[PDB]
Design a protein around this ligand. Sequence first.
Ligand SMILES: CCCCCCCCCCCCCCCCCC(=O)O[C@@H](COC(=O)CCCCCCCCCCCCCCC)COP(=O)(O)OC[C@H](O)CO
Ligand SMILES: CCCCCCCCCCCCCCCCCCCC(=O)O[C@H](COC(=O)CCCCCCCCCCCCCC)COP(=O)(O)OCCN
Lengths: 71, 157, 76, 387, 54, 116, 105, 85, 78, 218
Amino acid sequence: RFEADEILTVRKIVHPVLQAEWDLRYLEHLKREREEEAKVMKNVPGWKVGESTTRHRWLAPLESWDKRPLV
Amino acid sequence: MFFENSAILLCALLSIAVGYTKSPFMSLMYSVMLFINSSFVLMMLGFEFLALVNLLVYVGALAVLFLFVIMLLEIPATELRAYSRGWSTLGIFVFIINGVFQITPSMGPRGIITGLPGAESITNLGHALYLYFADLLILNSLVLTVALFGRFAIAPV
Amino acid sequence: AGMGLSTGTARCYDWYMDYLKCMDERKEPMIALRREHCLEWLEDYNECLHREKERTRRQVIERERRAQLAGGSKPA
Amino acid sequence: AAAAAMIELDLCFGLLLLILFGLLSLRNGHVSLAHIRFICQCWLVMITPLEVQDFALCILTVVLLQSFHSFEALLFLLLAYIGQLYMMHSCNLVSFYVCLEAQTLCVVVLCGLLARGASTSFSVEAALKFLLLSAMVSGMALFWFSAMYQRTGSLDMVGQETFWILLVMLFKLGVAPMHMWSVDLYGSIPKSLLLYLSTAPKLSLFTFWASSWHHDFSVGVFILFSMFIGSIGAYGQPALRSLFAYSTINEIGLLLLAVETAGFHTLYQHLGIYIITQLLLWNLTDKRLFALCAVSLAGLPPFAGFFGKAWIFWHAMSVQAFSLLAAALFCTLLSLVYYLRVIRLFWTAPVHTAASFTGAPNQTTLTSACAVALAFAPVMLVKPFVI
Amino acid sequence: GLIRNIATFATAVVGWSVGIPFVVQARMNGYVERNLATYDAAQRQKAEEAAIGG
Amino acid sequence: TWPEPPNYYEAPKHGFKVTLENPTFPIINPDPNITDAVTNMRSENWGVVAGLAGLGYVAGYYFGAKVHWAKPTALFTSIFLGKSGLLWGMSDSAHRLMGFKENSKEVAANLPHVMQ
Amino acid sequence: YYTEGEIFGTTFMYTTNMMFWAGIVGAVAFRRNLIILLLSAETVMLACNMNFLFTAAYLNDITGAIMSITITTIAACETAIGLALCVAYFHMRSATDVEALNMLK
Amino acid sequence: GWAYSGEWGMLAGFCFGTLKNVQEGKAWFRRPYIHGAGMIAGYYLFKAAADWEDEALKRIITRYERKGYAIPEDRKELFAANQYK
Amino acid sequence: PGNTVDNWTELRASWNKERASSLGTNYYLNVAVMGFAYWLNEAYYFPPRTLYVGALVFFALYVRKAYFSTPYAFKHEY
Amino acid sequence: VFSGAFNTPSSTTAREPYAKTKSSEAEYGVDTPVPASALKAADKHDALAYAVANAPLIGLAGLAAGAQEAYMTFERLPPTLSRQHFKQAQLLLGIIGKKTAYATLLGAVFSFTDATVENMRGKHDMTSGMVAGAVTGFLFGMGRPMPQPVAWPLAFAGAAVAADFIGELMPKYMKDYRIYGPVVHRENWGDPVPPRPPILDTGAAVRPSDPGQFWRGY
Ligand SMILES: CCCCCCCCCCCCCCCCCC(=O)O[C@@H](COC(=O)CCCCCCCCCCCCCCC)COP(=O)(O)OC[C@H](O)CO
Ligand SMILES: CCCCCCCCCCCCCCCCCCCC(=O)O[C@H](COC(=O)CCCCCCCCCCCCCC)COP(=O)(O)OCCN
């Protein structure tokens, strides 16, 4: 129990740093994707680059690095 | 991802193969292959414990009961009109229409879904089973009690 | 019944709660009448669930990319 | 805090004590178990909440237990009652599935266990067919629940997948053309389980329907199928068990007409009168009272079956469901002919009722004579009573 | 015979593993095409409603 | 994205049946144990426990005498009905202690230093 | 137009739909015995269990796993009772039927 | 509820006892203690039904007024009444 | 009316055959309803002349299950 | 009230038509929408499009009867015939297809004759249904012994007449029917006015023909 409590405390310390690093990387990837979309759809009439789909709540990507199939 | 998709698609082939063959023994062998392959398919989704439950219950316990019943009750009658009567074309048409072309699919209007692996937590399952769904757990126990008493009452004397 | 598999709650639980809160705060005497006034939250919850509109946007960008490579193959 | 769940702990503790008491009584070689039956009835009363429908089911099951004699049959009926009670409180498809499957397993095992004489293999055959037909309906329920769960992300019972769940519910009521499992069951299984099968599960499932179910569809074609098939089948089948199976299909078609036009008050009134008639029908030893069941199942005016049919007809005419009403009136005109056949068979005949020899002298004359006084209930039925 | 049955099973497994992905690919292509038609019809309706709706 | 670090040693405080009420009476104890439930039980609860036990004894004696086993049947039936009544009474007392039922008698007896 | 995850998901759903209809229809279509009918009922249960587990992973939700455990319990209990009844009926009717466990002949 | 429901219940109990005798081959007056117990049970059952009449009327008026259906005071006495008609 | 030998041969006709079990009919009925009864969902809104003529057409083309017999039961080739 | 001299209600009538009765504080209907296929199927201005919209439903009845007859024929097949799967499939599909095509033909003939007489007479009444029934029943009854070439036109015309009377004319005649609130044209009797029509969760075969009869939904 003492070992588990120490590891939980360290994970609580490290978790905001990792979430911040994820956030900055996600923003850079979005910027690259918007540049690519602006290069593809420049001549399409009425298209808007960067149109968020939802209205209030941010939508995380469905897939993630940490969930992989076992076999 | 050729082998994973092939392993997924093999389950439907084994499902057809269970009923296609004339040998009851071979039907059970196809079912055992299907349940092992499906337990490996469920582990592509991230489920380690529930795939093992699938294996342990269906292959370990229930198929032994199937093989005992078949081996005790089946004198060979595959020639005795199991081959000489064939099958039903109306049933095959129903299977083709509903399971190959799939005119009434489960996804309904949607046709594409993104498969996502999970991360099974058995602490979450233990918390759910013994705190949030505890009444369902007890009623499952009551169903198992019905099975035990009812079998021992229905055992042929 | 809304408990998460590896997290505390499901990934679209809060969108569902937004929709149910909207349905709670209306005053129409029928559920079918109340549903007509909360369609935006139901749409956002469905977009959380299946991401049909994000997939549609990506399909449209792919159609334009396949159009700008077959009809346009301009050499230098 | 678990202080709001003492009735559940009481249910489980009572089952644990009842199994041990039944074991101790059987180690003495007791060939009768009236003490076990009284403890079972006490347990039934002690676990039932204070609603009208819950206590209607409870009192019905207390009366039904007097026709069952072994310990295992009493245990199976109690564990079927748990499913029947808790299905009325089910607000999801999880609990719905578990309660329905517990009831199906209990019915199958009881059909296997209680058969005797030359009719043993016929009962086992009909139980096997019922189990196989029930398995695929249970699979349909699970499959479309999985579809709904994937589409909505929650446990709400909304959308297009509720049509198949409705078809599952219609199977459990023996609605034509999915009716032939009940027709098979009526021909071979003994009278006590036939009495159990025609009363309690219909009450449980209709109370779930009244309490927690909405669908955006119709059941009118199944109303037409049930009424026409049941009436013509009971007109054409000379065996009495098949006559009563087909007349039951006709009655469930009338109850579905009451469900389809809303107005569940007429549904509940007709169902109660039908259940009392069933309690009279399967416990008859004097065959002259078989004519009272006939005149009160034909809807003849002064008896209570007329009132149960006539509020269904009144509410159907109120919301202008004209075509289904016309079909119901035609099938009511047809039903009279075979209820008159019943009256010809058992009223215009010399009376013979054999005495008991090994004690228990005409052991259910109390219940049958009490249920024949459905000629005095019409004074209360004409008032605004069931609403 | 045993060799014939093993060969027939191997043939059926390989043929199923190559043939069904074409069925699935055709079905997904049909869904993509119908979805793109729905998107274009929705854009047309939006332009019409902007034209006569101010 | 990055999940919460799981706490394996902390289980959620949850009873499977949720009351969906706020209490409308003063709260003496939000979570009473069995000793707290029995020590603040009213006399009508003990009366209905004893009535259920007596009715159980008499009816068990009647039904157990047909198979010449009347005394153990009476004892078992008495205990069976009596524990049903005792669970009912303890639940009623706990609900009065938690504030979901009227507890004017219980507030003037369970707070010796918070009497008035 | 679509990604590898979308191929994987659509392949899973197509597979389970064909599995469900195979278990529902096929053993009846091929005019098989009651034992094989119970095995095919187990195929139906397996298809529903795989669908629930896929959805539980897809939504990050616990209800599919609860349903999975419940389905395994109910399916095994029903199958055991059915096989016991099959054995009892076979011993009751084999003196005059021979093909007693085949009601689709 | 109805004023004469107890007398109806007593007639029901008498007919119950007579039928229990006729089913078992006895004359109508045999075992008069069965008639007496049936009369008591019928009286209390039909009095309970007459009480449910008033209870149902009270529930209907209470639910209808909470939903917004305002009933005039000349018609509220048709419902909120233990009328012994 | 008639002759006793000829009438009794008419009574015997087409019944010299083992009767099938009812499990096939019941399973096929349940499959038909559970797979294809959703095709009638929009039919409830169709005009009533169409619905009434369709009901009469189903009654006119119905074949009765009791006393049913085919000539195909006693021939050795199609 | 009752005398041997006369019957007073036979001559005590209103002198003017009445105004519309107010039945509720809200006078707008609530209902689920009709699907567009049935909306299109009601249109009779194009006789061909009317027959194309209506005939597949009448063909569904023949499909059901043919599937029934095909299964009942399949069950009786001896093993020497049942194992020949191509011949079995062509026999059963022949039975089903003949029934389906005959039902679709009868339905298309009925719908086309109905809409043709409708457009020819310029008005909607019961004559078009009777003529369409006579034509369809004569098509069914041809080639049969003789009660039948008269009996079958009568049966199909009677089905059309029952369809008009039960499904169309009686709902039209009772559009002002009210079960709740003030008695119609007897508002002086003082029956109270509810805030709304009653909410009923009826099935799709029981839908309000007027906005004021009831509110349908949940
Ligand atoms: C011969 C039979 C006699 C029976 C009667 C005598 C035996 C005594 C009865 C058993 C104990 C009393 C009843 C339960 C007491 C709960 C009250 C309570 O709060 O107690 C503890 C509550 O803990 C429990 O023991 C809970 C019991 C859980 C039971 C779960 C199953 C319920 C039944 C489910 C059945 C499902 C339905 C089946 C049909 C569908 C903890 O006390 P606390 O909160 O003061 O302590 C705090 C501490 O940190 C621990 O929490
Ligand atoms: C010879 C017999 C042998 C068997 C033959 C089997 C027949 C083939 C199998 C069925 C094929 C047709 C079924 C699919 C129709 C799709 C219609 C378009 C789908 C669509 O987007 O609209 C839907 C509404 O359509 C609807 O409401 C569709 C209703 C259609 C009913 C089913 C077809 C008619 C009945 C069978 C034919 C009988 C003819 C007899 C000659 C849902 O709308 P949404 O907005 O939610 O969509 C969301 C997505 N955008």
